[PDB]
């Protein structure tokens, strides 16, 4: 129950932060990414951005009962040993970063 | 060698294949129900009806594997037949198929039993377990259509049908394997797949390479079928699901373990924990069993680049739905070897899945495709395009002596009846049967004269076991005949179709010679209107009595009628109507709803489709057995469709031109049609 | 051409394989433990 | 080998260790394995 | 009375015949070790 | 051939091993007896 208390307080604080930032960024775009549903099943717009960071390509991410971490990655990363670049292996192609 | 991965040992009870570790197996080839025709209610009802017998026979020993295979069918042989006009039609219509799918869908569910002096008695108990399982599965799958594969004799040494499917699953190509004294896993692998050293892709030699997409969904599916998007595609594949049903005590323990594990976390998710608790409550009350589940998709592509493109397209199609495929880079060997039934150990990542979710992921939905080969006369008589871009292999003998052959064609004469009748007859000529034709019009005569047989129209001025002939003649008194001359025949009924009482005597006499001439050689009787002959006193009785023997012979009555309400399904016509094997319903602008639905047992949604075709749309609904499809034999440019449609249709001007040309030519090697080609279109123009 | 009388015996063949194999496991532990005890006799005698 | 592939993947380390994310606790806010709640803002920047 | 998810998983994955083969292999190995101890005793006595 | 050829195969292959162990035990026992005597 006290973990629930931490949840509630943190959510309130973060919502306050987002409201203040949105009011501060009126001249800027200031668009908050949130859940968008498509096809009778929910999707997560923020998850797509984090996937793009980790996968290197924009892959839509359905939200399922399992945790986000286990099924987030669909591309195998191959960081070089004694190197300054890395390679992502994907069906669309191989991306060197 | 590769015999390690394949576990099957030898064949028992003629319907079960034993296995290493004493685990009896049974294969069922299931023709899935048509998902497109039915509405949304029927699909839920079907899911629940399957769940009925699934939970009813559920036990820790029980398990099920589901495979759907998309095969590039070469079993169509493109046969040869001597007629010239039918050759033109066949060649052009084959040319029309370029760029279109020829893949077919085959679904298989293999029920397997693994039990966890008196040894023989316990063996009897074990086999009778699978005996009862198969019996209840057959009773539960009556509507779907399930053929329990079993041994079939061949030239004195048997072949077991189930082995052929399990071979196809690993070999990839249908190879007949006989029953020999060996153990089956020794030699059933004619082709050994070779996988890459790193394991990204696999290779199979005829060469076809394959790649695997791992699919695992952990939450409930919204739709009764979420994977039906794959049923139309440009890539062959095999899709697998295993359901090793856990016993209830293990299910409770797993739910409690996962619930506690979710509880112990830094961040508490109230939604997921509540959902899992609700599922736990449902488990006792909503009596659905849980089992370990895993799904693998094994596409086929000639080149690895094509394989990767196919994988990308499959992933995109899957992500259109809310299912995210996880590509397999390594352990492709384990995943592929997981496909073979009874290979539990090589399963990549089993996940306990509710039975309802399992049925939602794999309900037996497939487009109509019929059976391209193996029909009692030979290959499929003809192939028709359908909506949703899937090919349909048409065959008459599809039933629920021998399977029924009778066919019903319902629709208006203008609404494509002529062209479809002619095309089906021309295709059916490939088996060279005897044809007896009765036409409501003079339309059929030109088509028949195009074929080998010469039509015999009826016009004014041209008319011991024979005790039956005399006695039937007395009934009328109350009010080149034989097949020796040529194979095909046609007798006009347009003369006595509208007549009140002249039809009966001539029908009675004609049936004598028609039936008695061949009598067991072959028969493909055709009536443009069959309700007119049946109003006879005597003819209907003999038809109903002798349909049994005619069915025993190679005899099929291809009935037809323009208006079913006109046929009115009289007391005598009931058997003729109900014993129809395949129904082709044309677009009927006017159709009495109640009589149309109740007489044909046509479903409400199927009726909605029939109405949807409306009027003057050249499509037809084919309901073979217990499934349906919207097939259109449309004739456009890709360009002879114009001329072989012009000859096929029958009009009084066309009829008189045909008769005059036939009588005047003398010897004409069907060269009247080139004369018929332009002599007609000039008048219309 | 008794098609099934030939595999009417395959069932009992599989049963007899299971029986012989479990019996072999039993005699395997039997001989192993007998050797263990008797070798213990030898080793303690030598000690 | 088939057993070799199994023993190799059993040795293999999943990537899920380095991705600390979990359920959406709120429609606009993501959780974390260490209870560090997150929200992403998509900003159309000012013209400079 | 399975009373264990782990027990059911192991029962599914486990191969019975291979299990028996491994059990007999272990039995013969232990018997060989016993023979080794016996020969050691013989040498010690000598 | 088939499982039956495996059945007799083990049915006498294990004969070989049982006989070998019995002979080894007999040899060891007679060794002990002779050396002690």
Residue numbers in the entry:
A (entry chain A): 147 to 243
B (entry chain B): 15 to 130, 147 to 236, 240 to 433, 441 to 503, 515 to 530, 606 to 764, 775 to 821
C (entry chain E): 12 to 58
D (entry chain A): 2 to 49
E (entry chain D): 13 to 58
F (entry chain F): 22 to 58
What does the paper say about this structure?
In Gram-negative bacteria, conjugation is mediated by a large transport apparatus—the conjugative type IV secretion system (T4SS)—produced by the donor cell and embedded in both its outer and inner membranes. The T4SS also elaborates a long extracellular filament—the conjugative pilus—that is essential for DNA transfer.
The IMC is 1.32 MDa in size and 295 Å in diameter. Three of these protomers are occupied to a significant degree, whereas the occupancy of the three others is weaker. All protomers were related by an angle of 60°. The main component of the IMC is the AAA+ VirB4 ATPase, for which 12 subunits are present. In the IMC, six dimers of VirB4 come together to form a hexamer of dimers. One subunit (VirB4central) in each of the 6 dimers form a central hexamer with a diameter of 130 Å. The second subunit of the dimers (VirB4outside; structurally very similar to VirB4central) protrudes out (in cyan blue in Fig. 2). The arches (the composition and architecture of which were previously unknown) are composed of hexamers of homotrimeric units of VirB8peri, forming a 177 Å diameter ring around the stalk.
